[PDB]
Amino acid sequence: GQLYMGQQGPVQSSRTTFGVNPDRQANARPVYLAPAAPMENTYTYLGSIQFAAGRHIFGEPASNVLPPQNIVPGVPTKHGEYVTTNTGDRLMASSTTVTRDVSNGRTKVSIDIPYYDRNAVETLKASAIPGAVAPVGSFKVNVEVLGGGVLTGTDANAQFALDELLSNMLMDAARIAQDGPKNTARLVAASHGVMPQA
Amino acid sequence: GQLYMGQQGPVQSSRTTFGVNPDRQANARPVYLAPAAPMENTYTYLGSIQFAAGRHIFGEPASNVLPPQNIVPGVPTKHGEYVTTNTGDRLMASSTTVTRDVSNGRTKVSIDIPYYDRNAVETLKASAIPGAVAPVGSFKVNVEVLGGGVLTGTDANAQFALDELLSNMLMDAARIAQDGPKNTARLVAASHGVMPQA
Amino acid sequence: STTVTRDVSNGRTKVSIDIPYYDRNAVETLKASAIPGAVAPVGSFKVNVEVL
Amino acid sequence: SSRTTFGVNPDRQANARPVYLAPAAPMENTYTYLGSIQFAAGRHIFGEPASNVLPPQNIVPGVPTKHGEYVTTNTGDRLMASSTTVTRDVSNGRTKVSIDIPYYDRNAVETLKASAIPGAVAPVGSFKVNVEVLGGGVLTGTDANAQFALDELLSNMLMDAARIAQDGPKNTARLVAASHGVMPQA
Amino acid sequence: GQLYMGQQGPVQSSRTTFGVNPDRQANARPVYLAPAAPMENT
């Protein structure tokens, strides 16, 4: 490579793999599985807008905090679900689901909430029809933490520090995801991004 | 080509491309995007006929002037939509849409309004059935301005004059489209044109 | 020629208007120089209207 | 594969960075000077532009291009319309702006004017000026903020180069019909 | 040569020796010869 001046004389710079231990520690670490899933932020906002945005009408949950669906204390699982059942006036009750998959150092949490056709629901109310409406679509939010491949000398204590580091990256990621003025479009029906000049 | 008399003597007429600059100016001009779409003419007529022509029954709009659906101030788009929601007695509410596409010097505005089956709606009212009717079809009107390829010396000020020229061609085109006595058939279910002898 | 075209078929009626334009630089150079050349159109502008 | 390096690491950053493209080209300096000399020097007569700021000819907003042109039309008395062109090329970290303005034969133009005869005249030649920035080879460590700093560094070298090119008394020959360069004494 | 617009159409510019009389008159003209040379300035 390039040439520089060492005390022996002019010496060639060199790039070597000598002295780098890339060995990894196996993803064999049991992790804490919450006994319920708190959806407080989303449901307080849904109470704020009165469970209706435009033509999307939403169901009222059973609880702001979701109970486990297929998780039992003391039984290890790689897939766990929490669920409640949204209900509403002239709405067929429909479940809202929070899924957690923990495999090979990869943790992934997904949230799926359904909605209904407000045009149909208000037609039902206004002309005094006796039927109900089934869900029309959903919205989904996924979050993923790739925490595999810790190094071999990673202390049992230092894995907790790494835990907190990843959780702070999580917070930063969601903030960057929703960052922006609420005067302007930023998430739904997205086509492309346009950052403003000033 | 042909022969004529020039002062040098009999001279051959000639047709050349010398001295004609056909260079064009790129379609890189931001255009004004209305903050709402006024449909006043069509909806005043729809109030005139009481939202019913024959078997076609129409919905009553939310507003004569339509708000933006996916347009945000200060965000440039090549596609923008305005919408309201028609409602009616024993009619499932249904949206009426006004679409504007602005690409490569071509501006295109389309209007789509739905209608419903009056035979079904009056059956509902007359025999006191509790259901409602969904839209049965629509009518659409398209308008297109091909304003691409302005010349290179077109002044910034003169592009406004060209703007107004195109808008006047628009007016003339719609007048030619609907021109004719209202005693005789001229638009819907059209098969061919027959201009009268006298 | 400036042209207005009407197509009526299968319930769809469509009116199109096409007007041509010439190179003002060529025309005015000819006029100022008192040259007897006549200029052919360099382009056109078009407006379409359609009823389904 | 991760390797520890002793000495210089010459890894360069790939030239894969979009750059800002002006929506028009300002030519204010040259056209104000052309107005100053009444669009005529010696036997060279120039045309009057439609605008001092040139609009894009083949550039569309939001569409990446590696070659773009701004253009206007010079018109003149007894003259055939001739376009003045500003070309910008961006490729592989090298960005180059070229300016081309045509001129005409003043003897033909004023002989026609004085003879009151129908002729008109086309351009005889042009003058061209090129400017080139070799910005490739950014090192690996450089982040975006540092790249902005490098942007401004190159622009300052640009200004220095133009000043060094035009440097000298206006009493004396310095650019056109150049044969060789000579330095004065004391 | 170059091309321009004449009233017949686009026409080629041309450079000719037609109509230029370069004939010269012989140097056969007696000239005045001063009867003395004034060097007053020097």
Q: DSSP labels for B58-86? A: -PBPS-SEEPBSS--TT---SEEEEEEEE
Q: Among A2, A19, A20, whose Cβ lies nearest the Cβ of D7?
A: A2
Q: Per the structure block, which two tokens stand in for A119?
A: 């045009």
- Locate tokens 């689901």: which residue? A97
> Among D138, D126, D113, D118, which Cα is nearest to D46's?
D126
Residue D106 CB: number of other CB atoms within 10 A?
Answer: 18
The distance of E6 to chain B (nearest Cα, Å) reads 12
Suggest the residue from E8, E11, E14 to mutate for an interface test with chain B (most B CBs closer than 10 A): E8
Q: Among D2, D3, D6, whose Cβ lies nearest the Cβ of A13?
A: D6
Secondary structure of D90-133 as H, E, C letters? EECCEEEEEEEEEEEEHHHHHHHHHHCCCCEECCCEEEEEEEEE
Nearest CA in chain B to D70: B25
Q: What is the rounded distance in angstroms from the CA atom of residue B139 to the CA atom of residue B116?
A: 11
Q: Which residues on B lie below 8 Å from D81 (Cβ)?
A: 19, 21, 153
Q: Which residues on B lie below 8 Å from A123 (Cβ)?
A: 91-93, 132
Q: Which residues of A176-192 are buried (b: 16+ CB within 10 A; e: fewer)?
A: eeeeeeeeebeeeeeee
Q: How far is CA D114 from CA D44, D106, D124, E18, in A?
A: 17, 12, 20, 21
Residues of E with CB under 8 A from a CB of D: 2-7, 13
Q: What is the rounded distance in angstroms from the CA atom of residue E33 to the CA atom of residue E36?
A: 9
Q: Do A11 and D8 touch (CB under 8 A)?
A: no
Bridge partners (DSSP) listed for residue D56:
D70
Q: How far is CA D155 from CA D17, D101, D144, D152, in A?
A: 17, 24, 17, 5
Q: Which residues on B lie below 8 Å from E7 (Cβ)?
A: 6
User: What is chain A's percent helix, strand, coil content, to nearest 5?
Assistant: 20, 35, 45
Secondary structure of B139-196 as H, E, C letters? EEEEEEEECCCEECCCCCCHHHHHHHHHHHHHHHHHHHHHCCCCCCCCCCCCCCCCCC
The distance of D141 to chain E (nearest Cα, Å) reads 57
Q: Per the structure block, which two tokens stand in for A173?
A: 């990621």
Q: Per the structure block, which two tokens stand in for A12?
A: 């060639």
